Design a protein around this nucleic acid. Structure first.
Lengths: 146, 229, 114, 76, 199
DNA sequence: AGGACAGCGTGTCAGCAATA
RNA sequence: UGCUGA
């Protein structure tokens, strides 16, 4: 049920200068794909630093066995094989997909904006591998440092 | 001190105003009449459309009505009103207006039948009128045009008239905005055209599925106008 | 002191406020502090006599008619409210101006108007 | 025959008021009330069911009038 | 040679005024420049124009440009004779300083037999009808006013009034009792239409 | 008929004492 | 008429 998987590395910890309290906006950049990631992460729970790697996955289900998710949260669920190889899991919805600006050029790149309650992420890169996304679609953002 | 004095004057100003404009109510024929029937306005705001309801009929608020289209039709107008609407009388009027304004880009150019029969101007100035004076003050060359036009033209097929006729009168004037669908103001339909053209060219590059068509958005806006009346 | 060499009736001083626009900054305006509409008609080639404006509303109503004084009334009320950020909807000023100018003249909204 | 087909808000208000003042004066309720003691709630219940035999007589500014039925009037 | 500029402006304005009333005027007269006006025509008796009406070819109008800066009763009679003999009914007297006050009630005294009308020369230097704020006026026909009164269930009184001395009722030559349609270019509704009874 | 002028006008909102 | 409250 994965829509995207990659190994990023943090390049900038907060360039814009807007600074929130417990949230930090990481500007990463993929390896072997040259995809770009802007990611608001709660750093009180999950400290992140510069020059740090992490395996990042976006999914539509946590079960990794096909069964869809029901949209209800039970902390009592008896299926416990949901992806737990990951330290930081989020859960948001994609709210904007916008093909890149360049006209007269191939420019078949897409920017997918995901909201995780209030923590935004933007995945930018070749459209070929951002097809699984679509506006109003719920997705999980699993992460695991390396 | 200024507060006290200002309020003292404002109270009197408002009392006078309220004591003169109090009997003006909108009638069942949409005309603003006084107590004795004297017509003050033939349409309230010059288009009807009381103020509080015209807040979202501004452009720049259509991308909101378009996004929330399903809720707006279910919650208010519903599929019932959209299909109980017949827009032909008003739609044809706007087509006529558009054709006219297409044939006359400059609407301050002195249209006239005889004025339209000044294209022979060169035909006359070449050789015909070269010999005269200002007979009765008009010209030596104007009299040739008067003679050629006056009775040396067809009886009923000298129809330079149609090429020079008035713009159809505005729709709200002829087609009763309340009971007539699609009869809106000339400044609203321009906005709706502009937005439909700038919205059919956004759906093309949208990466989100839109299940609304330009001609359902048009009916939505026309109903939302007809109901803010 | 009250002996004046020569003056246009009603005009006390002119002045050219160089710029009035950013969109088409090239605009120039010949503002005045008096009011004589006909004594400007002679300069239809120096100045634009369409776009002529005055705050008098009785002089406009005498040189251009009452349907032209309606809009001066509306614009005057709007510009009076604008200096404070207030903004009354045009549908109200339209009705006030249509009632004031109902019977062909600019009639006051006061004890002699009733 | 030429006025608007819908029921203006002032007409709804006056029709509800009159139907309520009638119900309160012991008039038969054609709406099958279900335990409510307010005559205005009953009048709204009747207006929603399209059971009000009243004739709105819209007056034009010259004395001419048009008689509409409360049933034949689009309540928004 | 500023007298010629004034004469040319007044003649252009009177040609526009005669075209707006529905008289047969050619494009060249309405688009005549100064260099060609002065080429054609110096005087103030060969500026007199005689114009015909679209319909009713007998119905023509005659524009005067008196020499006397202050026209009087005798000046009025001298060309009321011209009108009576040439068999015309309407006239238009452009005066340079005014009319002596008795003359204004004489022009009024001449019954529909010979209806005249005066215009100051400073009133014709520009076409007020071409101002931004002045809407378009249209004299309604006797069969459109009836349909208006029937549609709105009106009476002819109980309608807004336009003064008979209004600078745009004097220009369009509208007699009393006539209703004029007015197309206001409105920023709110585009092309609002109003009606005013001339009185 | 150029004035001189005498002549009407209004003025947000409720309480208490107290006294005509 | 002197006070007072928005």
């Amino acid at each position: 049920g994965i829509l995207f998987e990659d190994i990023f590395d943090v390049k900038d910890i907060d360039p814009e200068g807007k600074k929130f309290d417990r949230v930090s906006r990481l500007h990463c950049e993929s390896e072997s794909f040259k995809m770009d990631l802007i990611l608001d992460v709660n750093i009180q729970i999950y400290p992140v630093d510069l020059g740090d790697k992490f395996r990042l996955v976006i999914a539509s289900t946590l079960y990794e066995d096909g069964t869809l998710d029901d949209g209800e949260y039970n902390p009592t669920d008896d299926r416990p094989s949901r992806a737990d190889q990951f330290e930081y899991v989020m859960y948001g919805k994609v709210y904007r997909i916008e093909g890149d600006e360049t006209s007269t050029e191939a420019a078949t790149r897409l920017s997918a904006y995901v909201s995780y309650g209030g923590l935004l992420m933007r995945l930018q890169g070749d459209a070929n591998n951002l097809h699984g996304f679509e506006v109003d679609s719920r997705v999980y953002l699993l992460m695991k440092k390396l | 001190v200024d507060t006290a004095v200002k309020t003292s004057r404002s109270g009197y100003l408002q009392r006078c105003i309220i004591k003169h404009l109090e009997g003006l109510v909108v009638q069942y024929d949409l005309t603003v009449r006084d107590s004795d029937g004297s017509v003050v306005q033939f349409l309230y705001g010059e288009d009807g459309l009381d103020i509080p309801k015209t807040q979202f009929l501004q452009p720049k608020q259509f991308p909101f009505l378009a996004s929330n289209y399903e809720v707006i039709m279910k919650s208010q107008h519903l599929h019932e009103v959209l299909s109980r609407a017949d827009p032909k009388k008003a739609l044809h009027h706007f087509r006529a207006i558009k054709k006219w304004q297409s044939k006359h880009p400059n609407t301050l150019l002195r249209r006239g039948a005889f004025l339209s029969y000044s294209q022979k101007i060169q035909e006359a100035v070449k050789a015909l009128k070269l010999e005269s004076e200002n007979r009765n003050g008009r010209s030596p060359g104007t009299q040739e045009m008067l003679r050629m036009w006056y009775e040396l033209d067809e009886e009923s097929r000298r129809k330079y008239q149609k090429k020079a006729a008035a713009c159809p009168d505005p729709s709200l004037s002829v087609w009763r905005p309340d009971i007539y669908f699609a009869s809106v103001s000339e400044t609203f339909e321009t906005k709706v055209d502009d937005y439909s053209q700038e919205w059919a060219a956004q759906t093309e590059k949208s990466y989100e599925k839109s299940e609304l068509s330009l001609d359902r958005l048009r009916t939505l806006l026309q109903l939302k106008w007809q109901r803010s009346l | 002191h009250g002996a004046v060499i020569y003056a246009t009736k009603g005009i006390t001083r002119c002045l050219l406020n160089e710029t009035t626009n950013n969109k088409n900054e090239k605009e120039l305006v010949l503002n005045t502090e008096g009011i004589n509409l006909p004594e400007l008609f002679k300069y239809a080639e120096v100045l634009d006599l369409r776009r002529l404006y005055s705050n008098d509303i009785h002089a406009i109503a005498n040189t251009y008619g009452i349907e032209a004084a309606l809009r001066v009334i509306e614009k005057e009320i709007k510009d009076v409210f604008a200096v404070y950020g207030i903004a009354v909807d045009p549908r109200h000023l339209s009705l006030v101006a249509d009632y004031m100018c109902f019977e062909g003249v600019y009639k006051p909204l006061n004890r002699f108007g009733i | 025959r030429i006025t608007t087909p819908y029921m203006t808000k002032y007409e709804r208000a006056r029709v509800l008021g009159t139907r309520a003042l009638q119900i309160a004066m012991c008039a038969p309720v054609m709406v099958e009330l279900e335990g409510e003691t307010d005559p205005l709630l009953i009048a709204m219940k009747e207006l929603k069911a399209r059971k009000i035999p009243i004739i709105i007589r819209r007056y034009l500014p010259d004395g001419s009038y048009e008689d509409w039925g409360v049933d034949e009037l689009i309540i928004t | 040679e500023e007298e010629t500029y004034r004469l040319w402006k007044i003649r252009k304005t009177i040609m526009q005024l005669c075209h707006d009333r529905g008289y047969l005027v050619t494009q060249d007269e309405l688009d005549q420049t100064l260099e060609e006006f002065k080429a054609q025509s110096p005087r103030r008796t060969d500026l007199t124009v005689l114009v015909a009406h679209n319909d009713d070819p007998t119905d023509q109008m005659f524009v005067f440009f008196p020499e006397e800066p202050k026209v009087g009763i005798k000046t009025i009679k001298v060309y009321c004779q011209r009108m009576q003999e040439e068999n015309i009914t309407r006239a238009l007297i452009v005066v340079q300083q005014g009319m002596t006050p008795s003359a204004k009630q004489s022009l009024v005294d001449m019954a529909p037999k010979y209806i005249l009308e005066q215009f100051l020369q400073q009133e014709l230097l520009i076409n007020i009808t071409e101002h931004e704020l002045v809407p378009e006026h249209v004299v309604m026909t006797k069969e459109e006013v009836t349909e208006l009164l029937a549609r709105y269930k009106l009476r002819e009184n109980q309608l807004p009034r336009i003064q008979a001395g209004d600078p745009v009722a004097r220009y369009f030559g509208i007699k009393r009792g006539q209703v004029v349609k007015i197309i206001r270019p409105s920023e709110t509704a585009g092309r609002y239409i109003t009606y005013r009874l001339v009185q």
